[PDB]
Structure formats: structure tokens, C-alpha cells
């Protein structure tokens, strides 16, 4: 059976009679090589998404990559729990979410990439006999903006399919 | 056998007669409601086809198709981010508690951040955290907000609740005892002040008898968050089917592509890719259809838990059954796995007596009404209470009003009214 | 980037108009991607066979397409359907609802007309300029409790006012705003006082 990816040491046990391990859902799992008889298990080689971070080609045209769920020793670099991320200079500062990439972390424009902040920390001065009262208001107004429709589309197959 | 439907009682219903507790019950009700999802990705290319360039060739001429399909997912997976946003990201400030705890006898150290700091969750939330149980072009996006900051919002969340109310949900937080704060939900819910200030101690006590009841609940009972579990399971059960079509004849001569290349020649091969391209690409469109129905189900529950923290955490509802069976005081939120969990403090009436009333009372030749509250008997002497609690006060004409004579209500009583 | 919704509902569906007419012009394996042309090349057998895998491509198309028409109208009926609960209970009236209408205290809000949705100002009442004050849960005179009727004991260091939640109005504490219900060894916090009888 021909297949593809790494191999490596597999603690596992198998019986004298079995030959290769099947993983669930019948997927290959390991294959145990016919001239030493040795398990050995087999993992496809790594493969991911490329994603691309920019603050758009108005302001600049630097970017930088993010593979997803790729472990980049075997491709600045930084690693986090959504990949690698090359092209990002990491910082030690807490922003709001610019560009959102995952796990906490985001990046902004040089690219450089943090952990998001949620928002401004400030401690209510909470006591047992003290209120707060507004002595003025001021009056907002917001706009909220609702869908409610789209366009009315009908298709007359008989001859959409062939004229 | 056949469903009993319930417990069948008459309520002893007569006209003049009425039924007013004398007692309460402060109760938390959990209710849970998913709010996300897990974000899949599939690349059509690598599932249908893996690694093989002619099948990629023969499959340029079915269209347009992996790209649907991958901008489907793709919203799918910011659908579950941005409702994640909606559902906990509502206040804009991270509030902190105080570092005393003087709540007037009110305990939240269960829902509160402990000094442990198991990534800085609270008991209950790690409670919830234990309790649920979690290669071919399937790839798994990790989520833009991860447990600890969905943590850090639900902490802040509550911090503002307990030390301002509501007002915090309105605009800048107004820091207010909770005593007055109750006092203001009782108003809330028709109860006098007083009413809360005679039992503070009972109320509190209560209070923290209902968070351990919900405590031993979630320790000891199982399948409590089963709704968040069977999204789990429907999901993983899709992503099996899906792999399992992945291993599938679809009508050709096997379920493996390189058998076919290295067991036909190319010409005849091509016939063999196709039918099994066919059969994939029909497996991958129907998961795709029914994932997106399933995010939108997810995404009517995350709007309506969303609701649920705006005008039951961030206010009083004064809406029945919409946060709790009863009287809604507040509500508590905690985060969960794939969702969230709201503990409702609501208000129970309890131990209701009999009483004797009258729409008005006649005196002087005239009719006068209560201005809240009901006129009651307990069967010598007439007196005014409110609605939802026993507290007879003398009829006085502070509390009533006038309205006409007593030659036209329905029921009138003749009683006199104590003029101070 | 303030009417990204609706953009994004007319970008979806050209989208999806524009996806399904490139689709037609695909070969679905088929020789050709134009019958007249199949028929003309084949024979009357060969040119029905890859007529009818084309047939069978293109009505898979057309499936998706409508399936995710649907899809997008049950989210656009989802959308009115609470376009409309907010007009019903934000425009005809005043909603008590916690941020249903806009952050901050409900006042009145206005639709106006969008090319393919609605618009909601939303006109709320935003508290502000703070100040700290020291409150008691009652007043403690003559051996009586006296609670605020629609207010709040308040004190600025040296007096004692009755003001409202959501506005500082100071103001004479009296018997027309406070009311008794009990004595001073119940209530946890009172302060000793005296109440002005009119
Ligand atoms: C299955 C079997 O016969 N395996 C043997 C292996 O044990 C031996 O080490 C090797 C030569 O060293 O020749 C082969
Ligand atoms: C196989 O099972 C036995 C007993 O059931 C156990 O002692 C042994 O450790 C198992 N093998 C492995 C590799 O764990
Ligand atoms: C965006 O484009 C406008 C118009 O060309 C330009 O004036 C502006 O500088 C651009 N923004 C940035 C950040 O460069
Ligand atoms: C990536 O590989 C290196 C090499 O051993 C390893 O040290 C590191 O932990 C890996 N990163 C992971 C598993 O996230
Ligand atoms: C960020 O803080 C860590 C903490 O040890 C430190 O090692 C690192 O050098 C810091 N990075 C920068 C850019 O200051
Ligand atoms: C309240 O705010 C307005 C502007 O927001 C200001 O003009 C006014 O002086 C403030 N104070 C009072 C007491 O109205
Ligand atoms: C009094 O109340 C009880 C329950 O609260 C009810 O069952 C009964 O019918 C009432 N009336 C009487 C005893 O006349
Ligand atoms: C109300 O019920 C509580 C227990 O729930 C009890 O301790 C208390 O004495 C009751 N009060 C009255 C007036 O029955
Ligand atoms: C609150 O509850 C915790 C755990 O149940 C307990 O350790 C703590 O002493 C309680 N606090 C008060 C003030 O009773
Ligand atoms: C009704 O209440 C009054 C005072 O609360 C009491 O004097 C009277 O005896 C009561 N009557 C009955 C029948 O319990
Ligand atoms: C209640 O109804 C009875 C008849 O069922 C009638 O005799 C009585 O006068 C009524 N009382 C009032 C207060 O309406
Ligand atoms: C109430 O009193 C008036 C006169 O004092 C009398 O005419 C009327 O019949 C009385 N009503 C009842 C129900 O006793
Ligand atoms: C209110 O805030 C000010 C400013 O920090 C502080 O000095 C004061 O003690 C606080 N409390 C009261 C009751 O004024
Ligand atoms: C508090 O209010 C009283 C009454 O208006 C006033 O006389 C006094 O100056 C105010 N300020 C202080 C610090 O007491
Ligand atoms: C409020 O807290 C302070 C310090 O914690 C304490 O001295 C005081 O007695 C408390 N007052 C009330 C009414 O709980
Ligand atoms: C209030 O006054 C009463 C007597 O009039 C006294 O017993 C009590 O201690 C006083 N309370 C305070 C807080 O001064």
C-alpha cells in the first residue's frame, strides 16, 4: 500500500501476526517494516494554510505570512498557538484587535504582533456606605443599521441550462 | 402507560377571596446556551484529490466549486468569532472586585476569581470545564478569544454587576453597595425596600444556599450541560461521516486513487478519478450545507444568549420566563466550553393565606381605592397590604384615593378610614 | 465603512450571481463547453452522452446556488423579523430593554429608508460628570425607620438630601418622600437623623 508522510519510533505494542495499525475512521496510522519487524508510525508530513496579515496597499506594502498549524523548524519568526508567523516583529504591549489572527493574538502596523488587550483595567471604588450619582447627561445618538431585504432572483432553467 | 400531564388541583377560585404570600424564596436557575462552535476548514483540493496532480487537473473542469465551499466554511468560522464578540465582549471596560468582600452578607467567592488561579477561573466555571468532554484536509482554526479572556470578560462582568447594578450597563459604572442594589430590584419587581431590609440576613443566607444547591448539582449530577455536548457530538459526528465518505467506492473499482493510477492506465484511469471526484465533491457539499444550517441554529442561540446578557445581566427584565421561573432579581454569567451559563436570581413567592378583600371601601359616601397594593380582611378588620408580600398597614387616606360613590362598584365594603 | 451590512448582502448576492454564471461556462469534463459546437463535432450517441454530463453538472450548480439563496433568506427573514421587533418597540414606544435600542436609558428612536435594509438613531440618555456621595439604607428618627419613597438618602460630609437614581436633585428630607416601616435595630446601616414634618 502506497502512501506518504514521516515515520518514527512508535511505542506502541502490536501482535506477531498483524502487520500495519489502522487509525479510526480507517485512516493509516502505522506500518510495522517486514525486515527487522519493528513498529514504526506514520504521520502525513506537515501541511497548513498560508495567510497573509497586511494593513492594506494603501499604506504600505509590507506584510507578513502566517502558516496555520505549521511548526516552522522544518520550512522574524515567531510561533503561536495558530502557527508561525514570519515577517512580525513580536512586542511585549497590549492593543485593541487590529488585525485579527487567533489564540489571543493580533497584529498591527513595520508588522508587529501581540497578545490583544480586552480592554482599559479600572477598578470600581466599591464601599459599603458610598454611591455615585451623575449631576449631568448628555444625550447619544447611535445608528443601527439593519438588512431587511436583497434582490428578488428568478431563473428559468430550460434555458439558463442550455439557450 | 399513558403521559400524566401533571399534578391536577383546583385553585379554590370565589369572588372577595385572595390568595397573598407570606414568605419568599430567592432562587438561582442555571440555564445554558451554546454560543460557538469549532471553526473546520477543508481544502476541497487535498480531500477529494490528495496529492495527485491529474485528479487537480480533471477537477479544474468540474468549476468553481472548492472555492464556494472554503468561503462557506471560512464564514462559518468568522460567524463563531464574531458571536463569541457579541455574546461576552458587551462591556467595554474590565472592572475588578474589590480587594475586601463586603457584600452585606452576600457571598460570590464560588463565581468570583479565586487566588489559586487555575488560569484564572472561578470554581463553578471550572466545575463546567470538567464536565465536558472533547489528517486529510481537515484543518481546526483556533478561536480569536481563548478561554482565559472569555474568563477575564465573564470575571468583569460580574465585578460590575455586584459593585453598580446596572448603571455600568448604561454608561460609566456608579458604584453602590449591594444592599441598595437589592433593595432597588425588589422595587423592580413590586417589593418595598423594607422588605429586604427586615431580612437581609435571611436573603443573604438564601442567597448562598441556592449557589451551593447549583454547586452540588454540577458536581454530582450528570448530563447537565448536555446541550453544548450534543454540539460537540453533532460535530464530531459529521467530521466521522465526512472521513468515512472519505473511504468510499462511490461505483468505481476502489476506494483508493493510486491503486487506480498504478492499476489502469492513464485514459482508462481518468474515468475511475472522475466517478470517485463526483462522489467526494457530493459527500463535501452536503456536510458544507448541513454545517451552515447548523451555524445558523448556533448563531440564533448566541443572539438570544447575547440578549439574555444584556437585559438580564446588564438590567432587570421585567419579561415572564425569559430569565428564570419568577420574579427576575439578576443574573450571574459563567463562561463554558463552547458557550455560556447563566445563574438566574430570581424571586419565589411562598407560603400564600387566605384573605378576604374588597375592590374599594366605602366610607363617608364615598369610594376609595388603594394606590398599590389590595385592600385584605383577616376576618374582623380590613387592612392594605401589597401584592407580593404580606405587610397589613391600617386604611388611611395617604395610601388610598378617592373616586366617586359607593353606588356603582361591584363588591363594595363598608369600613372606615383612618384620617391622620 | 458604516453601512458594511448591506454591502456586504448586495456582495453576496452578485457573488452568487456572477459564481453561477461562470459555472455555466464550465466543461464538467465535456469536450466542449457550447452544445451547438458538441453537436456539430459527434456523433448523435457520444454528443447525448456528454450533453447529459453536462446537463447533470450544471443542475448540481443550480442546486447550490438555490440552496444557498435559502440559506441567506432565512438570515435576511432572521434580520427583518428583528428590524421589525425594533421598529414595533423602539419607534412606536419606549422600550425598557436593556441595549435592545441603543446603549444608555432609551428616549425615542427614528428609522429612515435604506436602499435594501433600514436605519435605526437610536436617541438615549447617557449619564455623566459623576460625583461620590455617602448613602444610608434609612433614616433613623423617633425610634422609626423612614425609607426613600422613589429615591435615595444621599449626604455631601455634613446634611442629609433624598435625591433621585439617575440625577443629583437633592432635597429636604421629609414625611411626603419617605415612608415607615419598622424600627432602628433591623436594618443594617441606618444612621440617626431627623425627618422635617410639613
Ligand atoms: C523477517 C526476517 O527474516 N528478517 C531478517 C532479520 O531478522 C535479519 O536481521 C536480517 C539480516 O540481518 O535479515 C532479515
Ligand atoms: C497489554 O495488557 C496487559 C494486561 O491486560 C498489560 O499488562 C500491558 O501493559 C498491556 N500492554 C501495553 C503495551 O500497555
Ligand atoms: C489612503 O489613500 C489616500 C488617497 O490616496 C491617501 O491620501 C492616504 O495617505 C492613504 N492612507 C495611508 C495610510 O497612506
Ligand atoms: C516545534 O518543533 C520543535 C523541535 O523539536 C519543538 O521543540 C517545539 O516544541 C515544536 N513546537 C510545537 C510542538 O508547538
Ligand atoms: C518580553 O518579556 C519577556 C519576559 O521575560 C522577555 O524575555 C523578552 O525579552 C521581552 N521582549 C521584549 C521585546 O522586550
Ligand atoms: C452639563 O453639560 C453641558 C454640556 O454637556 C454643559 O454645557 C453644562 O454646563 C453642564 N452642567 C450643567 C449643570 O448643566
Ligand atoms: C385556603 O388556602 C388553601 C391553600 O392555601 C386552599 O386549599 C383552601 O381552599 C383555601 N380556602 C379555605 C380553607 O376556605
Ligand atoms: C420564611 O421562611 C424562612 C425559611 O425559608 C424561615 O426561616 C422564616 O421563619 C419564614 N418566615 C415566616 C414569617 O414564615
Ligand atoms: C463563602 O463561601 C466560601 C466557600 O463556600 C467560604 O470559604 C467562605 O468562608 C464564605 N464566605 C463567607 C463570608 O461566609
Ligand atoms: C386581625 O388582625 C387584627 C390586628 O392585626 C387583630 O386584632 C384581629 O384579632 C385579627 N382577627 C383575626 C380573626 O385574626
Ligand atoms: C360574591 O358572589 C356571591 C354569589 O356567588 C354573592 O352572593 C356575593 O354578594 C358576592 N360578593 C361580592 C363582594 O361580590
Ligand atoms: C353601608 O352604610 C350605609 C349607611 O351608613 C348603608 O346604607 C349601607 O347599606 C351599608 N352597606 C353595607 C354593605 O352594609
Ligand atoms: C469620592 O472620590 C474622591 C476622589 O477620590 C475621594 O476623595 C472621596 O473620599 C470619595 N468618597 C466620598 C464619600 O466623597
Ligand atoms: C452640604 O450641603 C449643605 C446644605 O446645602 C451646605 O450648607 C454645605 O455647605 C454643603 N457642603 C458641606 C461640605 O457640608
Ligand atoms: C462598612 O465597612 C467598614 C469597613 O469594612 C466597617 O467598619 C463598617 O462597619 C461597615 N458598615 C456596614 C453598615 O456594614
Ligand atoms: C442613635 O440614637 C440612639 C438614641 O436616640 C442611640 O441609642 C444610638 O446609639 C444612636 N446611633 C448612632 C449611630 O449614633
Not at chain 2, 464564514?75 to 464578540?85: F, L, P, R, S
Not at chain 2, 463553578?124 to 470545564?129: A, K, M, P
Not at chain 2, 481518468?270 to 452536503?286: A, F, H, K, N
Not at chain 2, 432587570?316 to 443574573?331: A, E, P, T
Amino acid at each position: 500500500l502506497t502512501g506518504t508522510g514521516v515515520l518514527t519510533e512508535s511505542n506502541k505494542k502490536f501482535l506477531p501476526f498483524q502487520q500495519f495499525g489502522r487509525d479510526i475512521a480507517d485512516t493509516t496510522d502505522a506500518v510495522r517494516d517486514p525486515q527487522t519487524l519493528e513498529i514504526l508510525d506514520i504521520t502525513p508530513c506537515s501541511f497548513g494554510g498560508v495567510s497573509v496579515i497586511t494593513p492594506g496597499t494603501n499604506t504600505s506594502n509590507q506584510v507578513a505570512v502566517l502558516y496555520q498549524d505549521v511548526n516552522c523548524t522544518e520550512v522574524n519568526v515567531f510561533q503561536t498557538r495558530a502557527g508561525c508567523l514570519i515577517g512580525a516583529e513580536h512586542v511585549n504591549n497590549s492593543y485593541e484587535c487590529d488585525i485579527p489572527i487567533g489564540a489571543g493574538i493580533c497584529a498591527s502596523y513595520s508588522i508587529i504582533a501581540y497578545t490583544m488587550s480586552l480592554g482599559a483595567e479600572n477598578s470600581v471604588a466599591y464601599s459599603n456606605n458610598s454611591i455615585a450619582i451623575p449631576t449631568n447627561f448628555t444625550i447619544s445618538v447611535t445608528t443601527e443599521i439593519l438588512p431587511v431585504s436583497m434582490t428578488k432572483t428568478s431563473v428559468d432553467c430550460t434555458m439558463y441550462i442550455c439557450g | 402507560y399513558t403521559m400524566s400531564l401533571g399534578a391536577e388541583n383546583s385553585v379554590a377560585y370565589s369572588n372577595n377571596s385572595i390568595a397573598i404570600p407570606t414568605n419568599f424564596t430567592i432562587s438561582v436557575t442555571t440555564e445554558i446556551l451554546p454560543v460557538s462552535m469549532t471553526k473546520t476548514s477543508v481544502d476541497c483540493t487535498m480531500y477529494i484529490c490528495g496529492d495527485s496532480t491529474e485528479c487537480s487537473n480533471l477537477l479544474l473542469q468540474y468549476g468553481s466549486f472548492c472555492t464556494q465551499l472554503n468561503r462557506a466554511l471560512t464564514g462559518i468560522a468568522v460567524e463563531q468569532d464574531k458571536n463569541t464578540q457579541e455574546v461576552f465582549a458587551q462591556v467595554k471596560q474590565i472592572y475588578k472586585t474589590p480587594p475586601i468582600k463586603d457584600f452585606g452578607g452576600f457571598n460570590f467567592s464560588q463565581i468570583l476569581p479565586d487566588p489559586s488561579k487555575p488560569s484564572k477561573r472561578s470554581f463553578i466555571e471550572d466545575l463546567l470545564f470538567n464536565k465536558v468532554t472533547l489528517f486529510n484536509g481537515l484543518t481546526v482554526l483556533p478561536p480569536l478569544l481563548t478561554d482565559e479572556m472569555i474568563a477575564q470578560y465573564t470575571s468583569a462582568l460580574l465585578a460590575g454587576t455586584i459593585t453598580s447594578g446596572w448603571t455600568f450597563g448604561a454608561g460609566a459604572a456608579l458604584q453602590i453597595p449591594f444592599p441598595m442594589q437589592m433593595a432597588y430590584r425588589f422595587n423592580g419587581i413590586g417589593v418595598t425596600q423594607n422588605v429586604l431590609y427586615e431580612n437581609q440576613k435571611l436573603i443573604a443566607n438564601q442567597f448562598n444556599s441556592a449557589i451551593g444547591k447549583i454547586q452540588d448539582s454540577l458536581s454530582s449530577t450528570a448530563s447537565a450541560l448536555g446541550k453544548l455536548q450534543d454540539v460537540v457530538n453533532q460535530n464530531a459526528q459529521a467530521l466521522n461521516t465526512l472521513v468515512k465518505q472519505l473511504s468510499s467506492n462511490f461505483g468505481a473499482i476502489s476506494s483508493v486513487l493510486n491503486d487506480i493510477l498504478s492499476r489502469l492506465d492513464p485514459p482508462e484511469a481518468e474515468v475511475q478519478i472522475d466517478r470517485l471526484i463526483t462522489g467526494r465533491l457530493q459527500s463535501l457539499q452536503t456536510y458544507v450545507t448541513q454545517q451552515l444550517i447548523r451555524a445558523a441554529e448556533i448563531r440564533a442561540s448566541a443572539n438570544l444568549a447575547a440578549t439574555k446578557m444584556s437585559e438580564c445581566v446588564l438590567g432587570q427584565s421585567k419579561r415572564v420566563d425569559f430569565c428564570g421561573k419568577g420574579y427576575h432579581l439578576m443574573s450571574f454569567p459563567q463562561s463554558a466550553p463552547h458557550g455560556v451559563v447563566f445563574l438566574h436570581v430570581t424571586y419565589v413567592p411562598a407560603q400564600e393565606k387566605n384573605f378576604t378583600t374588597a375592590p374599594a371601601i366605602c366610607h363617608d359616601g364615598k369610594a376609595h381605592f388603594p394606590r398599590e397594593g389590595v385592600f385584605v380582611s383577616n376576618g374582623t378588620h380590613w387592612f392594605v397590604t401589597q401584592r407580593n408580600f404580606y405587610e397589613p398597614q391600617i386604611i388611611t387616606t395617604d395610601n388610598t384615593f378617592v373616586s366617586g360613590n359607593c353606588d356603582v362598584v361591584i363588591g363594595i365594603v363598608n369600613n372606615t378610614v383612618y384620617d391622620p
